[model samples]
Target chain A: DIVMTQSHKFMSTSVGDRVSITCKASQDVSTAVAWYQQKPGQSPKLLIYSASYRYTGVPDRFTGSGSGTDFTFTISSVQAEDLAVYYCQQHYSIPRTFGGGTKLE
Target chain B: EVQLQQSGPELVKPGASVKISCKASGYTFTDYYMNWVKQSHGKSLEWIGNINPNNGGTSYNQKFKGKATLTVDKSSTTAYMELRSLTSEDSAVYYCTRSPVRPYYFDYWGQGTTLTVS
Candidate 1:
């Protein structure tokens, strides 16, 4: 199992403020990382896939970067509706694993 | 318009077994694989297993090899996950997601079925 470590567990920011969440993989995973957003009482929504490619219908404000072991999901000019927990997943191997999650406040 | 409609919540007694269903629509069911995930209330997600609807092939997370079973009924375009010998730890919201064109990235997810084991 690949362990995804999300350094920041909680982030506090206001609307229009730029915030970024970081995730590091235990081993080299290339660009197989994906980012997902999950709100309370709802299933997770894919925000970015294959590291930096934004998923269908995802807003431009949501961007992803980095490759290999380090990846980041950045929200530019965040909106009120952007308040949710963000998670990073690596699909490089079996038993795909996810980060602990970062809560945007 | 692709959607995965899952079954309703279930409350079962400890040591009992529960099976949840996910019905796929708006696309060819056998074209992709269906993956089952578990999420405890206020916790992160866990990949239980994935089933290839076309051939009924399946793979599971080592930790959930025996605890979770994945199956599909192509005739009904529905996928199922059965959790056996349920306990408090197995009480969580289970979801069925579509693998889309890629095997790893899931594009569509079911509304989720909440299971409570007491």
Candidate 2:
């Protein structure tokens, strides 16, 4: 199992503050990674894919970067809508493991 | 707007099986792969597997290979997931999302089906 770990269970930050979340893969996965956001009572929404490419209709402030085992998901300037559970998924191999999830506060 | 409308919630007994469906609309049904994910309340997501709608071919997570099955009915433009030998651990929200390109990343998602095994 390729463990995708997100150390923070919850992050504390105020509106308008730049926020960053980190995901670490057990093995090298290049950039075959994607970021998702989930609000209350909603399905996961694709934020970024292939490391840095934002999904269609996603806001420009959501940015992703990094490769290999380390990756980061960043919100340039946080907004009320951006405060939710963020997840990182690695699609480089089978079983496609996901991070434990980081809930913004 | 592209949409994935999934079936309703299920409350089945333990050891029974349940099959959930995801109906696709607003796009070519055969143009993309449908991937299923499991999210236990308050937990992370798990990739169950993905099925190619064009040919009914599937790729599964080894941990879920025997626990879950993926199928598609081209005639209805819907994808199905049948989970067997249900347990409390399998109780979660199952989502069917559309994968548009290779190395599949989800772009559109369904409303999700909530399953509870008791």
Candidate 3:
């Protein structure tokens, strides 16, 4: 099992602003981490996979980078609808665990 | 053009069992694995397990193995999940997502079904 820690327990940014979120794994996940966005009262949507590849239909403004233990998710130009809790997950192991999440306000 | 259609909401009594269905359409169901996720009320997402629609092979999170079972029907391009020994803690919205090709993030997703254990 692995633990994921997300920076900024809470996030606040205005529309059209740049937002950066960081996620670190307890151990090296070898770019096996993924990022998801869950809007209010909605199911989570995958944004980045393998820490870099954007999921299909995801906005180009959203990007991911970093490898192993440190990963970052940045929204180059955040939109009003982008406000939501973001989570990081790893598929490196069987019992995949997730970060506590960074809530956008 | 891919989509996973999940069953409707359910209300079950404690200690009972509930089965949820996810029907994949717009593509070959066997092309990707069917992944199930659980999210408690107002909480983050939790991976329950994933089943390969081609062979019915399944893998699950240890924490969820005893409570969740993942299955699929390749003929119909549908996946199913059964939760046993339900408790109030099992109450949450469950979803099924399709992994893109292989070794990739989930691209197509289901609408999700809400399960309430009372």
Candidate 4:
């Protein structure tokens, strides 16, 4: 199983600010990484898939980059509603694993 | 327009078994694979397993091999996950998500069902 480490447990950014979160994979997973956002009391919504491809209905301000072992999920201009927990997942193996998650405050 | 309607929350005693259902709509049920995930309090997501609605085949995480079972009903366009020999550790929110495309990334997810084992 692959271990995804999200170093930041909590982040604080104001509206209109640029926020970035990092996800480091234990091994090279190529581009088989995905990012999800979960608001309070709600299920996670997919924001980016295959590292940089934005999922359907995802906002343009949200961009994903990097490959192999290092990946980043960036919000170009954070919104008030963007304050939520973000998680990164690697789909390279059978027992897919997720990052610890980063919460925006 | 895809959506996964999960069963309601459950309260069950320890050592009992519980089965949660996820009814998918707005698309072909057999078109994609359904994956089950467990989310504990303030923790990251855990992939329980995935079941193919078309053939009824399934794959599970080694950690949940005997604890979780995945099944699907093609006629009703629904997926089911059964957890057995439950303990306090099994008490969490379980979600069913659909992998609409290849390489196995979840695009649509159920609201999730809370299971409390007391």
**Considering every candidate listed, which one attains the maximal lDDT?**
4
Query: Against the true structure, what is each candidate's TM-score?
Result: 0.97, 0.95, 0.93, 0.97
lDDT, model 3, position A57: 82
| lDDT per residue (tens digit) for residues A21-47 in model 2 | 999999999998899999999889988
What does candidate 4's lDDT look like per residue over A7-97, in tens digits? 9998999898998999999999999999999999999999998999997788889998979999999998999889789999998876888
Better of 1 and 2 by TM-score: 1
Segments of candidate 1 deviating more than 4 angstroms = B101-103
Residue runs of model 2 more than 4 Å from their true location after superposition = none
lDDT of each residue in B1-118, candidate 2, tens digit only: 7889999999999999999999999999999989999988888888888999888999998878899999999999999999999999999999999887685688889998999999
What residue pairs are clashing in model 2?
none
lDDT of 1 by residue, A1-105 (tens): 899999899999999899989999999999999999998777889988899999889999899998889999999898999979999999788888889999999
Give all candidates' CA lDDT scores. Answer: 0.90, 0.90, 0.85, 0.91
True contacts kept of 2: 0.89
TM-score preference between candidates 2 and 4, better one: 4
- Model 2: DockQ vs. true structure: 0.80
Which residue pairs come into collision in candidate 3? Answer: none
lDDT of 1 by residue, B1-118 (tens): 8899999999999999988999999999999989988888888778888899889999998889899889899999999999899999989988898886464687889998999999
- lDDT per residue for candidate 4 within B24-78, as digits (tens), equals 9999899898999889887888888898898999989888999998989999999
DockQ of each: 0.71, 0.80, 0.61, 0.83
Model 3, residue B67: C-alpha shift (Å):
0.8
